[PDB]
Amino acid sequence: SGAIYVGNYRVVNRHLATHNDWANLVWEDSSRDLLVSSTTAQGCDTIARCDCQTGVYYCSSRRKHYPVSFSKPSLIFVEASEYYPARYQSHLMLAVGHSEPGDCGGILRCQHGVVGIVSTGGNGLVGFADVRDLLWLDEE
């Protein structure tokens, strides 16, 4: 589990969104595994606006933050899971690292701020849904 809290927005994995998230919906995209809802309180996270390929992510199944090198956001085939059939997921970045299903939502960050959140895993790989292209998270 886990979310990004930036301005009056809550960014979560679409497959983990709650009823309250759907009832306060701002934007959702199944192909990216992302959903954004509105919040009453202002958040403290800042979004990275960069092309970094190194950062650090939080892994709840190890209670640890790991430094990783990660690929550029792209269209990657993801195996079938409890939440989606086998399909191509867009704006996804892969790294070598530990990830179990419940690790989804952990933040990946670089020197500029939050890059994305854990969305996929298995086989000693971890995949992150990029949010650096969602410029509207910084305003309104």
CA distances for 140 relative to 16, 20, 42, 104, angstroms: 25, 20, 12, 27
CB of 108 to ligand A1BRV, least distance (A): 13
- Which 23-62 positions form the footprint of ligand A1BRV (CB under 6 A)? 33
| Among 9, 99, 113, 134, contact with ligand A1BRV (rule: CB under 6 A) | 99
Per-residue DSSP letter, 93 = E
Number of neighbouring beta carbons within 10 Å of residue 63:
7
User: Cβ neighbours of residue 135 under 8 Å, at least 6 residues apart?
Assistant: 49
For residues 48 and 99, the answer to whether their CB atoms sit within 8 Å is: no
48 binds, among ligand A1BRV, Zn ion, none (CB under 5 to 8 A by kind): Zn ion
Cβ 70 to Zn ion shortest distance, Å: 11
* Contact flag: residue 67 with Zn ion (CB under 5 A): no
Which parts of this chain interact with ligand A1BRV (CB under 6 A)? Answer: 15, 33, 78, 81-84, 89, 99-101, 103-104, 119-122
